[PDB]
Write a protein that binds this DNA or RNA. Sequence first.
DNA 1: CCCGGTGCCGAGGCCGCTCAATTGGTCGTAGACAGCTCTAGCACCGCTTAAACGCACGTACGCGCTGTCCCCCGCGTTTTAACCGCCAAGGGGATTACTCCCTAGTCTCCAGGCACGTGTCACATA
DNA 2: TATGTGACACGTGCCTGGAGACTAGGGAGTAATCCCCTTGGCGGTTAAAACGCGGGGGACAGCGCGTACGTGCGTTTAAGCGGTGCTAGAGCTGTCTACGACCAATTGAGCGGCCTCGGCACCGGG
Lengths: 87, 89, 89, 89, 88, 77, 90, 89, 486
Amino acid sequence: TYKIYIFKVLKQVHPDIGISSKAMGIMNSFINDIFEKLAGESSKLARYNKKPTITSREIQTAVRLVLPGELAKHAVSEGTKAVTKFT
Amino acid sequence: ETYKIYIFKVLKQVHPDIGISSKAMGIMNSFINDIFEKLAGESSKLARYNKKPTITSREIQTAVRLVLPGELAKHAVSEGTKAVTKFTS
Amino acid sequence: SRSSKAGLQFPVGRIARFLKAGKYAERVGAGAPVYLAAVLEYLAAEVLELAGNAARDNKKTRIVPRHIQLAVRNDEELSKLLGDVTIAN
Amino acid sequence: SRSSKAGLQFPVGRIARFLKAGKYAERVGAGAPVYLAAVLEYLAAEVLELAGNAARDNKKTRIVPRHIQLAVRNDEELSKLLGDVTIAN
Amino acid sequence: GGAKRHRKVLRDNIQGITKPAIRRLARRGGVKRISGLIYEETRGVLKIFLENVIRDAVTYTEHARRKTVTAMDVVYALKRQGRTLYGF
Amino acid sequence: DNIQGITKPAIRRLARRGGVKRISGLIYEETRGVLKIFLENVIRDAVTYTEHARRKTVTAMDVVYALKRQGRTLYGF
Amino acid sequence: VALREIRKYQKSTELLIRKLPFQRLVREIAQDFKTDLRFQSSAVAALQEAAEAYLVGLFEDTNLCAIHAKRVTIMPKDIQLARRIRGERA
Amino acid sequence: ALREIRKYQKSTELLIRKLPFQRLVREIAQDFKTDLRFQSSAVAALQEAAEAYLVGLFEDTNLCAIHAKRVTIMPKDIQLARRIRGERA
Amino acid sequence: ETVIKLQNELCPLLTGGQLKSYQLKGVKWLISLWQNGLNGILADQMGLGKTIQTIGFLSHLKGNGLDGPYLVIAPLSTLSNWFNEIARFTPSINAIIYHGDKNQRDELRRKHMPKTVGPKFPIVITSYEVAMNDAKRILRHYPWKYVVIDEGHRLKNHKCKLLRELKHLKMDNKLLLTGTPLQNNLSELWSLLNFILPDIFTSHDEFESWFEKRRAQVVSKLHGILRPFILRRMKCDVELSLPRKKEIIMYATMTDHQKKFQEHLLVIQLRKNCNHPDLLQGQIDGSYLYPPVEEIVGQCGKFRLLERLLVRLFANNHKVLIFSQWTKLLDIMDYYFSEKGFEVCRIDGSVKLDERRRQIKDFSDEKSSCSIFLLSTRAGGLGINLTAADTCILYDSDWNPQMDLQAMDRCHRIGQTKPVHVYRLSTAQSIETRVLKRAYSKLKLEHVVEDKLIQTDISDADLDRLLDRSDLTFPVKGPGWEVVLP
DNA sequence: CCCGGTGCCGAGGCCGCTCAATTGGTCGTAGACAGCTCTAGCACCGCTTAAACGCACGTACGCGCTGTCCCCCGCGTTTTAACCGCCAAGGGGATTACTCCCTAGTCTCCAGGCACGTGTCACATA
DNA sequence: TATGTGACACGTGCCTGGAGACTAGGGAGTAATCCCCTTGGCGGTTAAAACGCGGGGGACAGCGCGTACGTGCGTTTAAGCGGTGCTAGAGCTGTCTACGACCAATTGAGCGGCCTCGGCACCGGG
Ligand SMILES: Nc1ncnc2c1ncn2[C@@H]1O[C@H](COP(=O)(O)OP(=O)(O)O)[C@@H](O)[C@H]1O
Ligand code: BEF
C-alpha cells in the first residue's frame, strides 16, 4: 500500500492537517485506480502501435488521454522534470 | 485477412437469393472484428484479474455472458457449448 | 480442419492464430478458438438474418448499409450490444 | 536509492515491480516507473490539497471521507476524471 | 378467531422500500413535492438496476467457481456498469 | 468566421432529420457552440494519438480510436 | 419545513434505505438468476450504497426536468423522460 | 413541414457541406498543434460523427420540448438535454 | 425445630415460611462468603430454588449495618415472580420492578429512586435489555453494593455486550444463580469464573491448559479449585418429599408424507420436514387455507403419537406441559387445541408480561380447566413455577441439553405432590437421532465435568404402562420408548 | 456558547524481523537512425449552378393569469417490522502437495484464398 | 426502352498457414484441513411506518393577443468538379549499439505488532 507515502505527501502540503484511516484507504484505492487506468491505457497503446516495449513516451500519451486538458498539462510538466533528474 | 468468404457462406445459408454488397461486407467484417476484439479483451482482463495465465473456454463463456445482453448471451453460450462438445467428441 | 470437424463455417485456425499473435495471454487453450468461432458465427448469422428481412420488406435483393442500420435499431438486443453505433450510410 | 535520486516521495521500485508483475508488456522501460510515479504523486497531492481546504472550512483537523467527496465535486477537472465514482460515507 | 386462517403473509420484497424511504431519497436530491406514482416508478427503476447489477455479479461469481457473492464481484460489476465504489 | 461556416439551412435540415418541427433563433448559436466543443474534444484526442506515433498528418484510424474512446463506434472508415 | 428537511439529509450522510428489506429484495432478485446463493455483508452494503447514489442522481435529474416544465411537483413522466434522455431505457 | 422531415429521414447524404466543416476542423486543430495535415477520410469520418451527434441531440431536445408542451425548441431544452446527458463541459 | 430457631437468628426481618435445612446451609454459606468477601455462584438445581435463600440473605444484610441499594438482573418472565416472592416472604421491604418505556423508567426513577443514598431504597429488579440499555445513562450514577444475576447462562459468552455494560458499572460484590453450572464446553465456564472472580482467572489459555488415569487426574484437579466457589445441592440428595422424575423418550415412525418429502429433498429443512411439515409446506406453497387438524394428524408429523399421549393424559386426569422451539409449531398446537375445543394458553415472546402473569396465575388456580398449557423454549422455559401440572412433554429437542433439562424440570418443583412424567418426542431414521446423540454427548460432558428400540414404535399397552406412574411413588428399554438414567 | 473534566479511539512513536530494492556484470534481441521508394495533400485559376440570404407577411404559437378543485403535506394514534443480542451448527472460503497431460515449438506437408483480367447480367439511369 | 457498368461467380499459379507427429515441463484438476463467516429464529423496545382529516398550495383547462417563425421569389456568394504541378511526408529494409532481464549478496524499509497520548467527543442545561 501507499499509506506512508500519502501521509508523507500530506505533511508536505498540509503539516497540521491530519487524515483519517478510512480517508487513507480511499486515497490508497484512488491511487491504485489511477495506476490501473494508466497502465491499461499504455498496454492498449502498445498493442495498437505494435510496440512490445513501453517507455516514458507511451506513459506521457496515456496521461494526456485519461487526464483532462487542464490536469494533464500539469502532470506532464512534472513527469518530464522527473525523467531529466533521473537520467 | 478478412472473413468475407465466411460471411458470404453464412448469408447464402440463411438467405440463398440475397446477395451482400461490398460496403455492407466491409461493415460486417468490421463488426465481427470489433466483437472479437471486445471478447478477447474481456477474457484477458478476466484472466489477469484471477491471475490465470491460460485462457480456457470458461473465460470465453464468461466474457460472452458479460458482453452480450439478453437472450443473445444464452443463445451464444448454447452454441459454444454445442460446438465445443462436437469438437471434443 | 478443425472447422469441418466442429461443424462451423468460420475458420478455427485463423482465430487461434489471432489470439496468439495478439498476445492476449501467455497460453491459449484449445477449446477457446472453437468456442469463440461459434459465438462469432451466431452473431454474424443473426445480424444478416434481420438485415436480410429488412431488404425483403423494401423489395431490395441486395443488402445495403442502410438495411444494416435499420436491423440493429429495430432489435432491442442488438442495439444494446452495439450501443451508440453509427453506420457509414 | 533510485527514488531519492529523482526526488520523488513515491517508491519508484514498487511501481517498477507492479508493472513487471502485472505483465502489461513484455519489457518495461527504465523511464516508465519514474515518470509514472511523478504523475501519481501530483494527483495524490492535488486531491489532498482540495480535501485539506474542505476540512479547513468545516474547522475539522482530521480529513473524513465526506471532505474528500466535497473536493471532487468543486474542481471541474477533478470531476471530469472522478465523476463516475461514489465515495462511501 | 380460533381458526387463525391465512398466514398473515408479509408484503412483497419490492414493497419493502417504504414511502418515507423514497421521500427521504427525493429530499436528498432536492425534490420539494412528490406525486403518487413516483413511488411505483422508483420501485420499478430500482428493481431493474438491481436486476442488472445482480446478474453481472452472479456472472462474476460463477467465473470464480464460488458459491458466495463477495464485495469485489459487486465492485467489478458496478465498474462495468460505469459507477465505481471507493472504500469497499 | 469558420464556426459561422455551418449555415442556418444546414442546422435547419439537421433538425428536420431529427424530427424538430419548429426551430428558434438561439438554437443556431447553441448548436454551433455544442458542435465546436465536440469537435474540439475529438480533435484533441486525435492529435494526441497522432503525436504518439510521431506523425505529421492525422489519419482516419486515429479519429476512429478517439470516437471509440469517446463512446461512439464508427464502421466503414 | 420542506426546505429545512433538504438541508438535513444533504449535510448528514447515512444509509436512508433500511438494510433488511433491501437485503430481502436483493436475495429475491438473485434467486431468479441462480438458486442457493449466499451474499456477503460487504456486498449487500455496496449494493445499497450504489442503489441509493443512483436513485439520488435520478431524483436530481427528475427535479431538473420538473423545474424545466415549470412544475414544482415531480411526475412519472419526468422520470420517464430522464430515463429516456440518459439512454438507460430498458 | 412534415414532407421535408420524411425526405431528410429517407436520405442518407451528408447535410453539412464539406468545405466549411473542413475549414472549421483545421481551425480547431490549429489550436492544439501547429503545421498539421488532414486526410480526406479523417475529415469525412469527423463530419459523419458530428452529424450523427447533432441528430441525436436534436432528437433529445425535440423530446424535451414535447415534454414541455411546446412544439418550438428553445435553448433551455438543449441545456437540459446536455445536463441530463452529462456531456456539459 | 432447629430450622425454625436458626431462621430467626440468621435473619429476623424474614417473617413467614421457615427455611429448611438446604436453605439453612445456603444462607450460612452466603453469610460466610459475605464475611470473608469472596464471591460465589449458586448452582442449585431447578427444584429447591435458591431465590428464597438469596432474598433471605438480602433481608439479613438490610437488617444490620448498611442499607445500600441492591440491584437484581433476571429475565422478563422472572422479575414478576421474584417481586411477588419477595413481597410475600419478606415484609417491610420495598421492591420495585424497573421495567417500562423511557418516560415510565424516568418517572419511576424520579419517584421511587432517590438520587442520594436513602434509608428505604427499594430493590430494583430489571431485565437484561433494560439493564444493558440503562447501565451507562442512569445506572452508572447509583452506586450498587450487592448485585444478583439470575440465570448466569446469559453471560456464558466472553463477548457479550451485557458483560461490557456490567463491567462499566461499579460492583462491590457479585452473585450468580444458575440452574445448570456449566455448558458442554470450558470457555463459558472460564468466562463465568472470570466475571465472578476477576483475580482468580485472568486468561482462558491457562484454564484450557489446566483442564484412563490421566483424564481422572485433571478432572480431580479442577474440581478442588472451584469447590469453595460453587455450591451444588441435588434435589434427590436433600429433598425426599418430592417424587422421583422419569424421562422417557418416545419414538414415532416416519409417516408417508414425511418419507415422500425426504425422498424429494439443509439441516433446517430436514428438521422442518421432521417436525410438523404441514404448515411449513403450506407456507412454502402460498396457500391461505389450512388443512383440517384430522388431516394433519393423519398425514404429517408425529401428531399421531401426540394425540395418543393427549388422550392418555386426558384419561390420567393431569395437566400437561408442551414445549416447542418454533413459534410455527406453537401456533399449530394452539390451532389444534382450539379446533378440538380444549382451553389453550400459550406463553410466547409476543405475549406481554402482564398477560404472562395473568395466564400463569390462572394455570396455578385449581378451578381452571385449561389442562393444555403451551410454553416456549426461549421464553417461559426457565424461571417460572408451574406446580399444578405434573406431566410435561417436549415436542422438539434443542441442541443444548441444559435448556431442555430446565424446561423439563420447570414443572418438577418443590411442593408438587403428584409424580412428574417427562416425555420426549423424536422421529427415527432422521436428523432427530443425530441431534439427540449430540445432546447425549453434551450431557455426558456436563456430567463428567438401542437401534432396534428406536426403530420400533410404542403400542397401546406400552402407552398405558408409561402413563401408569405407580413406580414413581418398566424396563430400561421398551418397544418404541427408551428411558434415560442420570 | 461554553462549561468543567470525560471518555474514546484512531494517531505518534518505537521496536524487531525480513523480504523488497540495488549495485557490478553478459547478452542478443528491440529501436533511432541515413536512404528511396512512389503516393497523396497541399493551393489556385476557370465556369458555373445548386445553394444561401433578407425583405414581406400573416398566422400558429409562448406567456400571465384568471377559477377551479383535487391531490399532496403535517400533525395525534398506534401498530408492525428493524435491530441489536445471541445459540448452535456446517457449507464453503482459503491454502499446500501432487501428479498428470496439454499447451508452446520445431521438421514437415499439401491445399485456401488472395492479387488480377474476364463473361455476364439487375437495376438504374435514361 | 436499352444498355452498359460496375457487381458478382470462376479457374488459375500460387503461397504462406493447418494440420500430422515426438516431446517435455510447468500450469491446472484434484484429495484433505481449518476455522471466517453465513444462514434462521426466538425476545424486547423503540424509533419508524401507516391509516384518517382539513385545507391551502398547486396542476390544469380556456382566451386575446402580439412576438416571432414558416413559406415564396429575384438574387448573390460560395460548394464543387475538373486540371496542373510540386513535394513534405508516409512506408519498407539492413543495421549496430545502447538498453531491458536473471541471477548471487546485499542491507536497510515498512509491514506486523505494543504502548501513551491527546483533538474531539457528550453531558444537559442556562
Ligand atoms: N423457604 C421456603 N419455604 C417454602 N417454600 C419455598 C421456600 N423457598 C422456596 N420455596 C418454594 O420454591 C418456589 C420459589 O423458588 P424456586 O422457584 O424453587 O426457585 P428456583 O428459581 O431456584 O427454582 C415456590 O414454589 C416456593 O413456595
Ligand atoms: F432460577 Be429461575 F427463577 F428458574
